[PDB]
Design a protein around this motif. Structure first.
Motif, mmCIF file in Angstrom:
data_model
loop_
_atom_site.group_PDB
_atom_site.id
_atom_site.type_symbol
_atom_site.label_atom_id
_atom_site.label_comp_id
_atom_site.label_asym_id
_atom_site.label_seq_id
_atom_site.Cartn_x
_atom_site.Cartn_y
_atom_site.Cartn_z
ATOM 1 N N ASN C 1 2.891 2.339 -2.609
ATOM 2 C CA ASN C 1 1.969 1.453 -3.308
ATOM 3 C C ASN C 1 2.539 1.081 -4.672
ATOM 4 N N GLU C 4 -0.011 2.203 -7.549
ATOM 5 C CA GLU C 4 0.213 3.571 -8.004
ATOM 6 C C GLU C 4 1.516 3.683 -8.782
ATOM 7 N N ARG C 7 0.692 2.583 -12.122
ATOM 8 C CA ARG C 7 -0.377 3.361 -12.740
ATOM 9 C C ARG C 7 0.126 4.711 -13.238
ATOM 10 N N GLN C 13 10.460 9.214 -6.065
ATOM 11 C CA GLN C 13 10.696 9.021 -4.637
ATOM 12 C C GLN C 13 11.437 7.719 -4.365
ATOM 13 N N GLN C 22 18.488 4.025 2.192
ATOM 14 C CA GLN C 22 17.614 4.310 3.316
ATOM 15 C C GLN C 22 16.465 3.309 3.358
#
Lengths: 397, 98, 49, 48, 397, 397, 133
Positions: C1, C4, C7, C13, C22
């Motif tokens: 997202n 997020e 935020r 990640q 990847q």
């Protein structure tokens, strides 16, 4: 189905965790769950019963909320929770009892009563709290078709059959050589008898063997094996095979020699035990074959010398015995046991409301006739009713 | 609560709040008084460093609800043997803070 | 997202997923720039942003 | 067994150790099963 | 009462969850509850003992607090917690030990020890984790008069009594007609015998029956029926009803017909089964009645004529056998079951410290005599002591 | 060792509670624990197996975290969780299978396989959720030298050995007096026989004494006592002491007189009972002694003079005996029971992959052979294998 | 040969004198020796066994560094010390078992096992300690 177990678990936690004086820190998740449940269930309408002796009960869900304050609970909060807890308990109990007494020939896994079918809608999915009991977990894992598993304490898998066979027979019933056995629950008591004391047989060894097929496959079976049978060891009067008169049976116990116990699976000899007693373990089995030999005593004392005359007149017989008992079992399919009581509750509600008999269940929900011909449809019905009974037993003790 | 003013002596081993805790049987305010009574710095060690930290209950902001409930309980209380304007002002200030 | 991602300010990640080359998928609102040149098509420039 | 199952105080136990006839008789008259069985066995012993 | 259960559960939870490396967000609630408990118990003296040989041991509470803000409970936390864990373990063990040896003909549910009576006050009622185990839930439900229930596996519901009945007899003891039975624990073995095989009786059929009451009602009970005798088939030399002399008994087992079992409740029959063997189900009863008959075979083989003469002097004699085992059942009042480890705990605490023989219990928990005279005062005291025993059993195995 | 239990608990809880639609408030702790454990597991390649038919397999963990944005879990989140949960289930199954098979003589508490040793690194101790099952708690308390226990129903401590002792004997076996007993599972049948019915012995009463020692200390045990003989009350033929001849045994049953039972610890009288029947309780014992008498009734009847003549030729011999069952027991060490699935699990694991027998285990893990010569090293290895077996069985039911 | 004895003596001293409560002054030499041993043995691997039925095992050394500045060691220090003490004990047991069962006709004084051959290098000689035995 899972929604019913979620309701049961949430209600149990609500009734057995909300006690006056407890801190808020141990009930926060439960408070949120209760508020979500009431804010989702309110405004609906439910009907249940109407079949047999259950009158049509109408339920309306309309309750307030639970405050997120009062870090320490007072008694007023306890009673306000208790009222809704009682109403939910009554609703769940009545819905479960209505569901428990309906059956179908096909698609037995799916619900049948209108209440559960309505509860399987989309908007009611918001309450799916958790799954912790054996039955609910096994059901939810079967829905994805993974390996199933149950643990039983001394189950009842062997169908009742007090049958006997005669290898050698005559209409006089005074010269017999055969075997007798009983299949009662978790007890197998086989016995092999002879009238001739094996004097005629070559090598003075009378071979005995017996086969008992299990209706289902078990895994991790602990078996207690004893060399003596305590049923076919007393004088008896038994009807003949076809049945026209009664023959006599005067047994004497002898030590079994070369006892062989084999657990097979589809024709493969997996586990073997030779001249061993005490306890044995079978990793995976579905059929049991036992073999033992009656041996004429090579040496004799005066008493046993007069016990067996060398001629045809026989006053006493000879018989060997074996004892097999299934201590614990793990099966891939639902069963009825001697520890759990779900079958008892199912029969209890059955005879409480006297619902007519469907063609898929023998009368009285008896276990012997049901296990006589164990069909997959009856198996699915058993699994569903047992899961519902386990759900019920978490609410009304 | 219509009780005599707390006669007290300075220097007793117990704080007055303990006496308040074991003299009032109104559950809300009694529970709040007990919580304040046994609210002390917690001795913890983190990475070999000694620190004094608050309790978890106040940290997430939850005791304020208890205080508000106790104050609202006091708001509608009878408040006997007290003049009119003084009692009115007291309970209206309590409502203001609640 | 992406919501997020902005935020919370985290980038752990996504960075590790992109560095090791990847597959990744991002869902969120983004303004677009339209390029209609086959030169840009042959010379890969749709991934250098 | 009497001190494990039945209840005996300290003075009562002290008197029972001395085998005083009074305490023994008062216990016997109370229909205590163990001591009555013991006395019955002792009577059965004298069979010549 | 429940405060002791809260103490035990909180102590066990602290011993379980408080380990190295755990995240505080996973045990935050438990740590806070433990801090509140040590806060509440602070500054209150305790005295326990003074009865029997129990040494009087005072108890004081002056201990520190456990912190809140950490990312992983390091070794400092567990090392500091172990000492107070041990101290509280010893305290609760001694308190429950003191509680379990107190009785009263009145107020048989209220606390009867100084520690417990001091704990039941309201200032100690801030600590109540939940009610997870079955016994605490049953106690709380009995506090509000609801539908209770206990689960068991082969309970010891029947007192030991090897009594026998005679119908036709004489001081010679050569031609009898009567019954024997042996009801031990969860097993009932009833055998009826004839010394004449009803040759002199009308219709060649002789009637047998037996009635056994239940000390308390039972619901949802699982029973298994096996048509045989395992303790009344071997030759037996027993005494007469007046002990004048002894009598011989050499039976032969014959298959019984008309095996009818009725489960009866309060003068009304609920479940009635005819000739159906295996596992049966009954839902509400307070007495058990069995009926069966012995039928002389119409045609015989020579051996039968050997062992069944018409003349008065009989050498072999006839009988029938039944077996009735109660595997699993649910009762209203608590039952002393050997499936759990409760009666063992109460007997251990009794015989270990030489408690005076109270006026409410039988001497040394003689379960036979205890169940022969079950009383509401006895049932209340037994429930209380067993609940306290099970509370103790969760900390000291 | 507790690391594997924590991993199994977390995996099962994640596979159960994380379902399509549950509110986020109930999975915060579970999600946090899962994120922490997946963070820690990254960057640690593992190799499993190496002994027996079990193939050597490789493992590597590189998986992303789980977001904390959604308020209610949807299908995609559930499936993404399942994808990693299945792989971790396979990993834990492989680790358990590798751990169970191996064994050692020393360091019976320390791990033996490679995976358990590698998990014992400091950085891997960051994963620990709870220790709620009984086995992990007993393991920890044994690690830290505290009294432990297990609630075992029907435990096997008495090895199967059918032995007998003769006090009066003849080379012709026409006049004998002795005892016969069997120790199988949790059953004790001890009987004493006389071929003279106590006519020549002093006081016309025959004494029988029998002591059965256990291999491990027991406590808090409830025992069912019945004055009966089951396996020594029928016409039986038995070999000789030297194994050269056979004799004839024809018993009858009387009532044993003055039945006394003793329970001793290191040969110290702790508890005793006289003539009590039904059930008794003992609190600490390691040797059970049975002492009783056989008595001749003073008065007889016509049917008695045949059985017991004063001369030498005997035809029917007298015998009495008792049956003793240990229904429940609590032990400070791990034993084989009837209410669990430990022995079956370990034996299945050993036998399915054809693992060679080591130095500290019998061929095929014969339980009787293990219990005959119980040793502390075998105790420790049994503790370890039982713990890992329970951990594995908590995953695949 | 001497390096193995140094390892054994250091392990004995560490497992003995590292107990919660003792003043830091009692373990200054132990702390320095242990820290040097850990920082020197790391980044290395060994293989042992390869004869008979002994466990053919591979070992890797990548452990961390212990704390240095502490007035009084708490249980955390003892736990993190033991977590590597046990590993070193197992390693020494494996090395000694692999060394004992080997034999040779020529030059018996010199080391024979491959692990002992590698450990005889000068770079490990910094782990040398007292020879009071």
């Amino acid at each position: 189905m899972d929604v019913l177990y979620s309701l049961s678990k949430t209600l149990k936690d609500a009734r057995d965790k909300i006690v006056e004086g407890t801190l808020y820190s141990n009930v926060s998740d439960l408070i949120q769950q209760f508020n979500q449940m009431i804010i989702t269930m309110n405004g609906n309408e439910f009907q249940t019963g109407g079949i047999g002796n259950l009158p049509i009960r109408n339920w309306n869900f309309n309750f307030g909320l639970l405050g997120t304050t009062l870090l320490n609970l007072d008694a007023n909060y306890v009673e306000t929770a208790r009222n809704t807890i009682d109403y939910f308990v009554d609703f769940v109990d009545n819905v479960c009892m209505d569901e428990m007494v309906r059956e179908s020939q096909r698609n037995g896994i799916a619900p049948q009563s209108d209440s559960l079918r309505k509860l399987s809608a989309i908007k009611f999915k918001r309450i799916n709290f958790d799954n912790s009991s054996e039955y609910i977990e096994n059901w939810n894992l079967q829905n994805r078709r993974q390996r199933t598993g149950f643990t039983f304490h001394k189950p009842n898998i062997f169908p009742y059959s007090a049958s006997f066979t005669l290898n050698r027979s005559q209409p006089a019933h005074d010269n017999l050589m055969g075997t007798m056995w009983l299949n009662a629950g978790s007890e197998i008591q086989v016995a092999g008898f002879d009238y001739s004391c094996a004097i005629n047989a070559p090598a003075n060894i009378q071979q005995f063997e017996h086969i008992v097929p299990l209706r289902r496959v078990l895994t991790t079976a602990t078996i207690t094996l004893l060399p003596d049978a305590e049923r076919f060891s007393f004088p008896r009067v038994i009807n003949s095979a076809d049945g026209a008169t009664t023959w006599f049976f005067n047994p004497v116990i002898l030590r079994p020699n070369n006892v062989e116990v084999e657990f097979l699976l589809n024709g493969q000899i997996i586990n073997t035990y030779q001249a061993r007693f005490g306890t044995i373990v079978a990793r995976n089995f579905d059929t049991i074959r036992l073999s033992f030999q009656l041996m004429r005593p090579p040496n004799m004392t005066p008493a046993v010398a007069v016990l067996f005359p060398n001629a045809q007149p026989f006053e006493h017989h000879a018989t060997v015995g074996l004892t097999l008992r299934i201590e614990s079992a793990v099966c891939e399919s639902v069963l009825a046991d001697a520890s759990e009581t779900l079958l008892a509750n199912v029969t209890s509600v059955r005879q409480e409301y006297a619902i007519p008999v469907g063609p898929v269940f023998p009368p009285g929900m008896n276990w012997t006739d049901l296990i006589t011909n164990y069909s997959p449809s009856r198996e699915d019905n058993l699994q569903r009713v047992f899961t519902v009974a386990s759900i019920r037993s978490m609410l009304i003790k | 609560f219509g009780m005599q003013r707390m006669h007290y002596r300075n220097g007793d081993p117990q704080t007055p709040f303990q006496i308040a805790e074991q003299q009032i049987q109104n559950f809300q305010v009694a529970n709040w008084l007990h919580f304040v009574n046994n609210n002390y710095f917690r001795q913890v060690v983190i990475d070999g460093v000694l620190n004094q930290v608050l309790n978890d209950n106040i940290r997430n902001g939850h005791v304020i609800n208890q205080l508000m409930e106790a104050l609202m309980q006091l708001s509608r209380q009878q408040f006997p043997t007290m003049p009119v304007d003084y009692k009115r002002s007291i309970q209206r200030g309590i409502l203001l803070l609640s | 997202n992406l919501e997020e991602l902005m935020r919370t300010g985290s980038y752990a990640q996504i960075t590790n997923m992109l560095l090791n080359n990847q597959p990744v998928a991002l869902v969120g609102a983004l303004p677009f720039v339209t390029d209609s040149s086959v030169i840009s098509l042959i010379a890969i420039l749709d991934a250098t942003v | 067994n009497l001190n494990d199952n039945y209840g005996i105080s300290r003075q009562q136990a002290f008197n029972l150790l001395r085998s005083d006839p009074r305490v023994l008789r008062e216990f016997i008259n109370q229909d205590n099963p163990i001591i009555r069985n013991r006395i019955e066995q002792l009577i059965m012993q004298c069979r010549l």
